[PDB]
Design a protein around this ligand. Sequence first.
Ligand SMILES: COc1cc2c(c(OC)c1OC)-c1ccc(OC)c(=O)cc1[C@@H](NC(C)=O)CC2
Length: 172
Amino acid sequence: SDLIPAPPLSKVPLQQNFQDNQFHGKWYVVGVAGNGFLREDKDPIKMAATIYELKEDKSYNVTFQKFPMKKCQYMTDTLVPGSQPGEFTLGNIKSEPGYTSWLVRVVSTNYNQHAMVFFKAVQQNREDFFITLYGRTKELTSELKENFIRFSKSLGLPENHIVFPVPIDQCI
Ligand SMILES: COc1cc2c(c(OC)c1OC)-c1ccc(OC)c(=O)cc1[C@@H](NC(C)=O)CC2
């Protein structure tokens, strides 16, 4: 299509010894890169924080601001553990107009500062993928943001498909 193809999974690193208990909580969206994310300097965006909640069954609740981030509205999905720690499927629980599931792979995190997470659509004829740069604070370092840009570019994403929203706590 118009879109840059998704990488094979083997090109997406997996965070080693992923600790679900240490990943839970609030994560600001500090960066988002994907074939369907488009930097428009004329239309900057702000994004509310994502909440990852670990449950008894080791799945998460995930509460996140909805795409394409025009009116701030939260949504909640289930993050079902996959083939191993760090990996999940994010499923739309009800069949609705815009519908796909995503494979979710935590690429790297140190739990208390940053995380980088890869999302790939499991729908047959969808190249759709994106990478989220999360921070525990609204601000991350230049080195951490350049590492996210380089990772994103290594999967073929142009720099104008890499967006840095203004992180906020809540919808307004
Ligand atoms: C847990 O966090 C996120 C999870 C997803 C999305 C997203 O970006 C707003 C997130 O925040 C970083 C998401 C992303 C891109 C999409 O297409 C470009 C889409 O159609 C759809 C989405 C999401 N669906 C909706 C309705 O927002 C599902 C996956």
